[PDB]
Amino acid sequence: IAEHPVLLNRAPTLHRLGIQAFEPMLVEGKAIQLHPLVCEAFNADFDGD
Amino acid sequence: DSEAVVAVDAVSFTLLQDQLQSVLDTLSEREAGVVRLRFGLTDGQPRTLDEIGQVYGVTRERIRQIESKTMSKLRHPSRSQVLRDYL
Amino acid sequence: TGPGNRPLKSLSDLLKGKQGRFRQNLLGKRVDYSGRSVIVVGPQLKLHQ
Amino acid sequence: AAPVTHIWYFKGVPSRLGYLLDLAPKDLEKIIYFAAYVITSVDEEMRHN
Amino acid sequence: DKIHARSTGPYSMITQQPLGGKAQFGGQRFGEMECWAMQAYGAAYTLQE
Amino acid sequence: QETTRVLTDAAINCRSDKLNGLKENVIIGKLIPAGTGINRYRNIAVQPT
DNA sequence: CGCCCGCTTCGGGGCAACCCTGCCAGTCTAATACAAATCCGGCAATGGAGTCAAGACCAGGTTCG
DNA sequence: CGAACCTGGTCTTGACTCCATTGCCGGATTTGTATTAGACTGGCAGGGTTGCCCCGAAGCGGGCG
Ligand SMILES: [Mg+2]
């Protein structure tokens, strides 16, 4: 996995910053852990998105 | 679509062809030639023992001896260990 | 109509509408090497992670 | 075993067959579904004699 | 119930696209708005892939 | 829009597409002519000095 | 004297977010008669393909005077 | 120093076996066609129910020649 980015999309992709690439790192459990600053860029809250 | 390509069987079959070509290249020229012409590796149409002896100048029975020897040789685990896992 | 009073999907109806080949299968396609999960916040990650 | 008019060049608005022959679309649907005849040709010399 | 991933699974019948939904494997719909985001980055190669 | 009506008068006029827009190259699988698909960047030679 | 240019009314087609998540729709004269097609099930034309068993032989390490 | 030995491949002969493979061959089934002689003589049928917009078409009032 190391140094191999992945594209993250939150549907719908309203504008250009709705797709953003991130270097992954493995995290236990089953949820995509997301940085707290890009939530405005995706317009993503955490109520089940 | 079950009729479509499984797309790992293709790379598996190509790797199987490569491993089988390596294992056949462990044999000699007469042995690998007899095996490839017996199973039709070169054309898809496997010629039989009389045609193989005709292209090898010998009897069909000599070819049967050679084919028995090569099937004895291939059944050794020294060749079988990297082919058993392909089924 | 077809059985059950269903209108038969003719040749033009494969291009018309959102169900046509253009907007359903030519522009937007389903992609392999994809994935989907519900997100959680990751306040120990760095911004590129 | 007998010719057929394309529905795209007849029924769409404006009717392209209708403009190409300067026929009204009511006349065109009256012709191409065998509801009314059309005088496809005429004579002049035998006509006046 | 919600997590999902597919590297290579089934494919559709008429067009040869991957399928959809967690019941099959399926891939995520890379729809039109994702395509506009990838164009707006200028990333042509990734859109081609 | 109007996939019927746009198509037929293009077919009447025998209008030839030029494959130089942006929605065209997305459809036919070529690289888009914007961002990393223009020939200012797509023909870069890289040699090690 | 009779005859057609702009409102005007009416038809009439196109389109109205993006992911998931599903998963299978029907009935009324009824029969014979036949000819051909075609399947199909089984001996017999093989005939060729495979198989066993013996053997011919060189010669090459291996055993002996 | 020279003579045999047993045994590897290498190949040959010839007989034996066994099974494809047509070829009939007779029968079974199955696919298509013809034929019914009292008299019968014009259909059932709901999706339509938006909103808005653009536009084509009819239609009439209006001045008009
Ligand atoms: Mg939310």
UniProtKB/Swiss-Prot annotation, chain A:
Belongs to the RNA polymerase beta' chain family. DNA-dependent RNA polymerase catalyzes the transcription of DNA into RNA using the four ribonucleoside triphosphates as substrates. This is DNA-directed RNA polymerase subunit beta'. The RNAP catalytic core consists of 2 alpha, 1 beta, 1 beta' and 1 omega subunit. When a sigma factor is associated with the core the holoenzyme is formed, which can initiate transcription. The chain holds residues 491 to 539 of 1316 of the full protein. Mg(2+) binds at residues 45, 47, 49.
Curated annotation (Swiss-Prot), chain B:
Residues 49-68 bind DNA. It is found in: Cytoplasm. Residues 23-76 are annotated as: Sigma-70 factor domain-4. The sigma-70 factor domain-2 mediates sequence-specific interaction with the -10 element in promoter DNA, and plays an important role in melting the double-stranded DNA and the formation of the transcription bubble. The sigma-70 factor domain-2 mediates interaction with the RNA polymerase subunits RpoB and RpoC. The sigma-70 factor domain-4 contains a helix-turn-helix (H-T-H) motif that mediates interaction with the -35 element in promoter DNA. The domain also mediates interaction with the RNA polymerase subunit RpoA. Interacts transiently with the RNA polymerase catalytic core formed by RpoA, RpoB, RpoC and RpoZ (2 alpha, 1 beta, 1 beta' and 1 omega subunit) to form the RNA polymerase holoenzyme that can initiate transcription. Belongs to the sigma-70 factor family. RpoD/SigA subfamily. Sigma factors are initiation factors that promote the attachment of RNA polymerase to specific initiation sites and are then released. This sigma factor is the primary sigma factor during exponential growth. This is RNA polymerase sigma factor SigA. It comes from Mycobacterium tuberculosis (strain CDC 1551 / Oshkosh). The gene is sigA. The chain holds residues 441 to 527 of 528 of the full protein.
From Swiss-Prot, chain F:
It comes from the Bacteria. The RNAP catalytic core consists of 2 alpha, 1 beta, 1 beta' and 1 omega subunit. When a sigma factor is associated with the core the holoenzyme is formed, which can initiate transcription. Belongs to the RNA polymerase beta' chain family. DNA-dependent RNA polymerase catalyzes the transcription of DNA into RNA using the four ribonucleoside triphosphates as substrates. This is DNA-directed RNA polymerase subunit beta'. It comes from Mycobacterium tuberculosis (strain ATCC 25177 / H37Ra). The lineage of its organism: Bacteria, Bacillati, Actinomycetota, Actinomycetes, Mycobacteriales. The chain holds residues 1227 to 1275 of 1316 of the full protein.
